[PDB]
Amino acid sequence: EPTCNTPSNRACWSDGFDINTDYEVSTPDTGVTQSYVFNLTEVDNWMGPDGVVKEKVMLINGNIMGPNIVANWGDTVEVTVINNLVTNGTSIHWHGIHQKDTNLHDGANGVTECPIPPKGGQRTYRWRARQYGTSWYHSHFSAQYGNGVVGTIQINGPASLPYDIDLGVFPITDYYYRAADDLVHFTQNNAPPFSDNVLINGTAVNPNTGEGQYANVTLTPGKRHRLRILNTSTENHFQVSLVNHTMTVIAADMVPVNAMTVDSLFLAVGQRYDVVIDASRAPDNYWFNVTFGGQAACGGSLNPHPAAIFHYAGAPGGLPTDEGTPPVDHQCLDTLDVRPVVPRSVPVNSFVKRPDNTLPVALDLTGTPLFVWKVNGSDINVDWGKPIIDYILTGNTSYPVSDNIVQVDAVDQWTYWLIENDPEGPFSLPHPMHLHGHDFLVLGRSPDVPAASQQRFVFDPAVDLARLNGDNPPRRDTTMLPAGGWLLLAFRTDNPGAWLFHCHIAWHVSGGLSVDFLERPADLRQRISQEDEDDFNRVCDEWRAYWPTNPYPKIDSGL
Amino acid sequence: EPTCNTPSNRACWSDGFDINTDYEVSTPDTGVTQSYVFNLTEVDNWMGPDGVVKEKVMLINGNIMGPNIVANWGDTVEVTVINNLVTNGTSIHWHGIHQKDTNLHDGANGVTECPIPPKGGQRTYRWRARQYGTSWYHSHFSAQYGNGVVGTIQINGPASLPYDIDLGVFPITDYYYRAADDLVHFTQNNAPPFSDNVLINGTAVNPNTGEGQYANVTLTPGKRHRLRILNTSTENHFQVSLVNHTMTVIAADMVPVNAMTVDSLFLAVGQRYDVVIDASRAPDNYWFNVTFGGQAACGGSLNPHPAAIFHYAGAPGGLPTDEGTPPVDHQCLDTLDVRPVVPRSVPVNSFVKRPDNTLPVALDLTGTPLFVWKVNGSDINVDWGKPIIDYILTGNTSYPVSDNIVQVDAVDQWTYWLIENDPEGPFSLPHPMHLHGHDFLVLGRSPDVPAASQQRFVFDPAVDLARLNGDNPPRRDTTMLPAGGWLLLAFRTDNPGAWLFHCHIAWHVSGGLSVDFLERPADLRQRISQEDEDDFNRVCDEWRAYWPTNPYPKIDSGL
């Protein structure tokens, strides 16, 4: 609960708690729990928001996304997930949510937990709100969030700007007619398709039948407005802009940033950015355009102009008439100009490339299926019925090779990670790289160049040390790995558990694009409570019980 | 020679020849032969126009391009080609030059001749210029033209518009510091690289050092000028545009067309557009920009802004100052609005797909190397030491698979060809499809989408007969095959010959992307002259004899 957060002062929140408070080491005690249930059901022949009937959808409480969770900073959020799907396991991952000492509530099935069984299994997740900002939650069961298992989190708190109205979440998703497993088998041997449409907060028009409707957001004239924009796509990466208006980014993912005003923004998959918009132009209807760039290397759509309408309150109705101007091609690259409100510094001199700090990504085309993704020479392939948490608990330390375990014992230390992008391969792609348990610092990346340019860059200290940023760099949970090049990441081992680090393109992690940071194993066995350990075996026993009866194979990594 | 061709009336040419004559059935008798020699040699460590030193080049008379051939409508062109390369054969193909019953001069090694042996090998081509306009010549000995065995052709004749100055040729080319064979070798297992630079009339600035010079054309203020723009690249497809000026296309490849005024034009490898430009703007310097569109699906260059300077005679020196606006994205597609001055009509109310009219193009990844191109189940591979003409002349009619033979017996009839671009494959790229011996009709294509939009079209009678056009359609020798799509074209069988039909990207034809039209083979043998026969046999003799002493392997189609 806030006591001094007001339109005129958003930086303050409670006594001793504000925009300057280091939220990773200090949280509010509110005593308040927001409770939620997620009841999942498979719908066949469902008539989607643009007119088109889909073969099958996977639906939370029978809507297009689940419940929009809202808690305040300091609260707890508890969610009982009941899986009334026909065949599918599930497991809800809370994206952006650090899980500080609650690794078991992470929802990375095969890693932190077995999936809840179909036809009625259930499980309560509970975690603390030690961050405030905009994130979201979705299935990590192979690519099922692409079927509909997904929604948003708003955990309210201080902002790095005053604003009058919080317009609330504005999520954006690529939207395909073919269901998520059809799409996985399809991308095992074939280039990912253009999305059939892009939904904006649930809705979009069919550029071919005219059915459906635009998102319609009403600005109070002369008021400033927080809008919380997200990319919930399985694959599209997006570029966004508001015709005749600037957007001032006040946070990226769930990390508040100094005010940074811009004409457009790239959001990858899993990215979010909260922004203020000042309704100070002429009363009217303005397009909100979704565009794309980086020469389709990070997706596009058969809808050639996905859009929403921003309508000033008092102005006539109907559609915008200024088409606007195209934004700068952002080239499948996020902006590294953002600067956290709450600093971090680490040194960006000393750097040595060695096998224990380096994650080489490589598309193997010489197997079956054609498109297989490998980190440090192995495609991930978790065991759904034998998560890493059952190894931890039963004391087994011989993790399979499939598991892609990257072991980190150092306690509370900064660790630097070189992620390499198939500099050697036949070709290289944009990958949206995202970390569970943690926000990383984006120390640096290989030169910014058009995405489809085939140029290949190997980290060199002679030239690349000079390019690193150790002084309050971007901190967030999702960033771009450059086409044919390299990302230099750093994270503080401040959270024992098994924490995935993967590309967030549903087809890519599906095909092998993951690691598993085993972060501080022995500490982790101790901080896992009896209620979690016990709930872990129940769900695991039932699943293992469920699994052999299931009429369909596992046909991908599990993630 | 012309007797009435003046700036005010370009349509006339001489007594009985004019812009309306059907140059495919009627030619001037001038009795004039224009003679040329091409003395080809290997130079190692050669400093290119942009200040950068290449490992190896193959040049014609010690320059970056060979003689600029020039002649009147009617004459003969007779070029002795003396091969003073170390290791490689050569065979100079005259591209856009139909070779009316001069098939053994077409310069397709493996098809119409053996390679001219290295170390003083020698052969003289003669063909009649029964077509005026702009085209070009280059090697066909695998990818050798990527090294410098290239140049251009201007057969003077009437035009579709009056103009005061012929600015003469302006060839545009991708420019790669690596040597052709290495590039071949590379693209066998890797996406093709963006060019290191683009040369315009033979020159470019290096955009990393500034060394070199811009191409620089003077305009006589107030005058109408004709520029004969060509795309001579191994790969890049280009978009061009003149800042603050229009261009009127008065010809396409060697087909004049009715005048068509545009803002910018797309040229695929091989293509040519003569245009008219009126220096009617303010006296100044303007950038002529080469840009790319179609989402790098057919091109890119690491020079961000290849440009030349169009300088108005009388205005001052220095660089153009108005940077201008990017042309439209032409999506890797040639324009089909173009109308030949001498029209052809065929029927388009009536088509049926069959094996015998259907070219299925296929990228095959299942083998060695990674990237093999297949048309109708087979990657072409010709035999430099037994050319299909040694078959026609030995009455041997048992052609290997490899040669990708297409027997068209019909005498002087329209034949229809459905070309399919891997609608089933893992992905599909545009291809510049080039027919030897003929100009084709472009009846049509799959409809026009973004080049990387992943869309797959199969020709459909129901839907696609209303998209065809038998009423004077673009006529030309190169046109685009759409990514995942199709193309329908036609030619008359008025030329007994063996005629390659292949994608002009050096890499893809090196890879297998060809067929061979064995056009009216019975007709062919009666028509080879004693001197053509014996000369073909001589060269074949010295090639077959040279070949066992060649130190490198053939690694590619041959072509």
Ligand SMILES: *[C@@H]1O[C@H](CO)[C@@H](O[C@@H]2O[C@H](CO)[C@@H](O)[C@H](O)[C@H]2NC(C)=O)[C@H](O)[C@H]1NC(C)=O
């Ligand atoms: C989870 O959900 C769907 C249930 O429909 C499964 O997807 C189907 O897989 C079958 C068997 O491989 C295919 O033949 C169907 O085409 C798929 N249909 C759709 C609509 O995707 C998937 O197999 C399931 N995975 C598991 C292990 O339960």
Ligand SMILES: *[C@@H]1O[C@H](CO)[C@@H](O[C@@H]2O[C@H](CO)[C@@H](O)[C@H](O)[C@H]2NC(C)=O)[C@H](O)[C@H]1NC(C)=O
């Ligand atoms: C914003 O979205 C709008 C509406 O979807 C886009 O407007 C379309 O513009 C195209 C492009 O010329 C027109 O042919 C359509 O008729 C427009 N739709 C409407 C309803 O006006 C708009 O172009 C987007 N603007 C930008 C920069 O992408």
Ligand SMILES: *[C@@H]1O[C@H](CO)[C@@H](O[C@@H]2O[C@H](CO)[C@@H](O)[C@H](O)[C@H]2NC(C)=O)[C@H](O)[C@H]1NC(C)=O
């Ligand atoms: C054509 O000429 C070039 C002349 O060098 C040959 O190219 C070389 O090929 C060898 C053998 O694979 C390589 O080691 C060299 O690196 C190549 N040099 C360059 C710069 O490309 C090529 O083999 C010749 N081809 C034939 C068929 O004789």
Ligand SMILES: *[C@@H]1O[C@H](CO)[C@@H](O[C@@H]2O[C@H](CO)[C@@H](O)[C@H](O)[C@H]2NC(C)=O)[C@H](O)[C@H]1NC(C)=O
């Ligand atoms: C056309 O070509 C010029 C040739 O390089 C490009 O213009 C710029 O080059 C100047 C040299 O004057 C540089 O300062 C700029 O960085 C380049 N222009 C920019 C930033 O766009 C030019 O852009 C090309 N323009 C067109 C018409 O698309």
Ligand SMILES: *[C@@H]1O[C@H](CO)[C@@H](O)[C@H](O)[C@H]1NC(C)=O
């Ligand atoms: C899930 O929703 C269904 C409606 O389809 C309802 O019948 C059922 O009781 C719900 N499950 C639970 C335990 O909430």
Ligand SMILES: *[C@@H]1O[C@H](CO)[C@@H](O)[C@H](O)[C@H]1NC(C)=O
């Ligand atoms: C959007 O909603 C507002 C407020 O209720 C209304 O003024 C307007 O009619 C709507 N316009 C659109 C985008 O269709």
Ligand SMILES: *[C@@H]1O[C@H](CO)[C@@H](O)[C@H](O)[C@H]1NC(C)=O
């Ligand atoms: C990559 O695997 C190698 C070789 O097996 C191992 O020595 C190395 O430390 C691994 N690196 C990472 C980053 O896990």
Ligand SMILES: *[C@@H]1O[C@H](CO)[C@@H](O)[C@H](O)[C@H]1NC(C)=O
């Ligand atoms: C070819 O050019 C060379 C120099 O490169 C010259 O020596 C030679 O005489 C010329 N050869 C012929 C046959 O024209």
Ligand SMILES: *[C@@H]1O[C@H](CO)[C@@H](O)[C@H](O)[C@H]1NC(C)=O
């Ligand atoms: C082409 O370059 C040549 C030099 O070989 C020059 O004489 C000519 O005028 C150039 N063409 C144009 C259009 O500038």
Ligand SMILES: *[C@@H]1O[C@H](CO)[C@@H](O)[C@H](O)[C@H]1NC(C)=O
């Ligand atoms: C281009 O040539 C013209 C005509 O000779 C001259 O006026 C102009 O200064 C030249 N410009 C450059 C940059 O070389």
Ligand SMILES: *[C@@H]1O[C@H](CO)[C@@H](O)[C@H](O)[C@H]1NC(C)=O
């Ligand atoms: C394609 O191949 C088949 C042989 O399977 C043949 O029947 C057909 O004539 C071929 N099509 C063309 C145009 O070559």
Ligand SMILES: COc1cc(O)cc(OC)c1O
């Ligand atoms: C733009 O995205 C892709 C293009 C491709 O060509 C292949 C892929 O996966 C194997 C891709 O993801």
Ligand SMILES: COc1cc(O)cc(OC)c1O
């Ligand atoms: C843009 O052109 C290509 C892209 C690719 O990714 C592979 C290729 O194989 C030849 C290509 O030609």
Ligand SMILES: [Cl-]
């Ligand atoms: Cl996370």
Ligand SMILES: [Cl-]
């Ligand atoms: Cl030709």
Ligand SMILES: [Cu+2]
């Ligand atoms: Cu996520």
